[PDB]
Amino acid sequence: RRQRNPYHFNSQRFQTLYKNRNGKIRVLERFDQRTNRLENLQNYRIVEFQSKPNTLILPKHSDADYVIVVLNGRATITIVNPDRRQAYNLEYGDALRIPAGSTSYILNPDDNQKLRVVKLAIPINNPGYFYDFYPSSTKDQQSYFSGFSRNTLEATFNTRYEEIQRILLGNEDEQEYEEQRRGQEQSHQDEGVIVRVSREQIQELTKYAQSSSGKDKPSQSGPFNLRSNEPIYSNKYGNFYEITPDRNPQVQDLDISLTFTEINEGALLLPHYNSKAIFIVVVGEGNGKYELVGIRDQQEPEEVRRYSARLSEGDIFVIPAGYPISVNASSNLRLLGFGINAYENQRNFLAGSEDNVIRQLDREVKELTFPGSAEDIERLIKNQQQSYFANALPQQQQQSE
């Protein structure tokens, strides 16, 4: 539409990196592609990863940090080190920092639930770009071991290339059949990087795992549910959870807050602005619209600019620091918030009866600030008795189907 939305990143702007019959691994366009208004976010990327019941992403390490949030189902994740090796179950809500270089792999042990993970990634080397290192050799990726010379591999493993090749790599087989339809496996596990897993294996693999279930609190060891603490804002229109970095060792070096806002249908996250935090917002569920307010630099009276977009499962949108936002709900809307620059943030609501900086003004300034009489503004301001969330005067039925 005339006057576009730089800050809106619909579902579609995910580029598939990897689809096989067991899961997908999408990544979102670089925040600074079309826009040049989102430069401070040049490093961050958003990955959605998805898998089907009883499945396994093969071991991977990346040149990037990861903050996992399970927006759907269960997974055991394992994280492997030079020294120890770990494993956590993770339920809906759970988040987890995978540091940069950790060998990890994620199993979906559920029997009928797809796994849905959304990852913020912070590249280490180059800005907006990381890569996935697999030891596995599939028809889809090769091992890094392949990038070594036979001599080097042979010294390395202390083994005839022919034995390495047979065991770690794979042999010459340069044709094709790849037709006919049913389902089974390939090589050993449904070929590719996302493979089908046996219960035998799920049982073995989960047996080590540190169970979540109980909503674990932001520590430095295991997963932490974004609903662990009591809502920060809670009433009968929604819930607002949030873990600020300073109270969360696992990410405090990344200076990320994480939020989980549930907006009930016909409800409205009343307008606020984030004082220093740039928020990357992720739709898990529901439908709605938002209104972000900017000053159109463009290039008489300084014009403000609404940047609106419909919302739905999968979309990303971004909230620049200082920019007032508000968010509707046609259907029960659930949002995941990655707040960059979040340490010391303060969310300033602009309506209703808490953290309302407009009311916190000096009487006589309200006076000078708005055309109404002082008293008219206290009354008006006070007409919204709900805080944080309210009713949005929703649409409904009447002579309608």
Cα gap 331→211, rounded to integer Å? 32
Of the candidates 353, 347, 349, 350, the one whose C-alpha atom is nearest the C-alpha of residue 387 is 353
- CB nearer to a copy of itself: give 163 or 217: 163
Residue 284 CB, nearest distance to a copy of itself (Å)? 23
User: CB of 251 within 8 A of CB of 120?
Assistant: no
β-pair partners for 196? 55
Q: Strand 389-391 relative to strand 267-274: parallel, antiparallel, unpaired?
A: antiparallel
393 touches a copy of itself by CB under 8 A: yes
- CB nearer to a copy of itself: give 193 or 243: 193
Among 326, 330, 333, 339, binds a copy of itself (CB under 8 A): 326
Pick the piece of the chain touching a copy of itself (CB under 8 A) from 3-11, 19-27, 222-230, 349-357: 349-357
Residue 91 CB, nearest distance to a copy of itself (Å)? 21
- CB nearer to a copy of itself: give 72 or 143: 143
170 touches a copy of itself by CB under 8 A: yes
83 touches a copy of itself by CB under 8 A: yes
367 touches a copy of itself by CB under 8 A: yes
User: CB of 370 within 8 A of CB of 336?
Assistant: no
For tokens 């008006």, name the residue. Answer: 380
401 touches a copy of itself by CB under 8 A: no
Mask 293-312, x = binds a copy of itself (CB under 8 A)? xxx-x--xxxxxxx-x----
81 touches a copy of itself by CB under 8 A: yes
90 touches a copy of itself by CB under 8 A: no
> Looking only at residues 205 through 224 of this chain, which bind a copy of itself when binding is defined by CB under 8 A?
205, 208
What letter does residue 11 receive in the DSSP assignment?
A: G
User: CB of 133 within 8 A of CB of 141?
Assistant: no
332 touches a copy of itself by CB under 8 A: no
User: CB of 51 within 8 A of CB of 106?
Assistant: yes
Cα gap 25→140, rounded to integer Å? 13
Among 278, 282, 329, 335, binds a copy of itself (CB under 8 A): 278
> Looking only at residues 21 through 40 of this chain, which bind a copy of itself when binding is defined by CB under 8 A?
37, 39-40
From the centroid of its chain, how far is CA 127? Answer: 18
Among 53, 288, 324, 339, binds a copy of itself (CB under 8 A): 324
- CB nearer to a copy of itself: give 261 or 356: 356
- CB nearer to a copy of itself: give 39 or 247: 39
> Looking only at residues 109 through 168 of this chain, which bind a copy of itself when binding is defined by CB under 8 A?
124-127, 129-133, 135-149, 151-152, 154-159, 163-164, 166-168
Cα gap 351→356, rounded to integer Å? 6
Cα gap 37→143, rounded to integer Å? 38
247 touches a copy of itself by CB under 8 A: no
Cα gap 145→162, rounded to integer Å? 14
From the centroid of its chain, how far is CA 343? Answer: 19
Segment (H or E) for 199: helix 199-206
Segment (H or E) for 163: helix 161-164
Residue 81 CB, nearest distance to a copy of itself (Å)? 6
Among 184, 299, 385, 400, binds a copy of itself (CB under 8 A): 385
